[PDB]
Design a protein around this ligand. Structure first.
Ligand SMILES: OC[C@H]1O[C@@H](O)[C@H](O)[C@@H](O)[C@@H]1O
Ligand SMILES: [Cl-]
Length: 291
């Protein structure tokens, strides 16, 4: 049971859950309303600024997908916008690394099958920079004009970015399409939880940012401790009223890899899941101390 949707069914599903989220009753100072506003901005960037210029059907656009929560939100929104643009397999690139979490590798494969992506992966056993990996990608796919990237302004290297922006001089020449820049961490959790799509299950165990296996720990701000003030959940409504699937769209979480559970159990500590963190400044706090 692999939870596979043909691309059109995936796009329609994403349109429907996004539309459903936009119909949620919320007040003007809520996280849900802020997320609705962020969705509307993303939709305008894609439908008004992107698709009229570059074709998402003929290989002009590739989607950079790394399995993390930001890329996943953006992929759901991108699929929704394809459906909206055209009605109302997908070329995908993953820059792989030798120090990626196994659960994340598993999740990228599972989602490629779920959403009918056409996945290209760079070679994890080659020592090369991201720019170099993308140069090789462009040799394989020379028709590529633009690449969708799921970065936010609060991420490292996120400050000096715009929604439509040519690449750096040492990259292959393409336009970066960056439609998620204005999203905040709380918006990411709200939408992802409401969507009821499978997500990388490391977040369930207290990770808030999936860096590499050597540096990344569950977030210490989420550690359970009798003598801390208990954390409160900001996403109760979304979780309790999450989007209901049907026979075609039915899915399930996939458990973390055996090796990742061993690493988490060896900590002898328990954590709230990642969606108990809403401060963007602390997203990357779960990290081995280095000199
Ligand atoms: O303006 C951004 C891009 O829009 C596309 O529709 C044109 O065909 C390209 O020549 C141009 O770089
Ligand atoms: Cl992440």
């Amino acid at each position: 049971g692999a939870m596979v949707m043909r691309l059109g069914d995936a796009a329609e599903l994403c349109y429907n859950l996004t539309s459903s989220y936009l119909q949620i009753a919320a007040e003007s100072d809520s996280i849900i309303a802020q997320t609705q506003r962020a969705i509307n901005t993303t939709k305008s960037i894609l439908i008004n600024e992107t698709f009229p210029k570059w074709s998402p059907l003929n290989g002009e656009i590739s989607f950079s997908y790394n399995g993390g929560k930001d890329c996943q939100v953006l992929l759901l929104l991108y699929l929704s916008c394809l459906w909206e643009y055209y009605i109302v397999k997908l070329p995908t690139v993953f820059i792989d690394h030798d120090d990626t979490f196994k659960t994340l590798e598993n999740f990228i494969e599972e989602t490629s099958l779920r959403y009918s992506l056409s996945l290209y992966e760079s070679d994890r056993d080659k020592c090369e920079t991201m720019a170099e990996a993308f140069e090789t990608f462009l040799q394989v796919f020379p028709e590529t004009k633009a690449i969708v990237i799921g970065i936010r302004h609060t991420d490292p290297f996120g400050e000096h970015l715009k929604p439509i922006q040519k690449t750096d001089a040492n990259w292959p020449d393409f336009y970066r399409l960056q439609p998620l820049l204005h999203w905040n961490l709380a918006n990411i959790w709200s939408f992802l939880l409401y969507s009821n799509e499978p997500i990388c299950e490391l977040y369930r165990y207290g990770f808030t940012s999936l860096g590499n296996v050597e540096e990344t720990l569950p977030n210490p701000h989420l550690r359970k401790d009798k003598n801390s003030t208990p954390l409160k959940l900001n996403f109760e409504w979304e979780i309790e009223n999450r989007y209901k699937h049907n026979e075609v769209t039915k899915a399930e979480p996939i458990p973390i890899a055996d090796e990742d559970l061993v690493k988490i159990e060896n900590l002898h500590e328990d954590y709230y899941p990642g969606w108990y963190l809403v401060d963007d400044k602390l997203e990357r706090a779960g990290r081995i101390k280095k000199k």
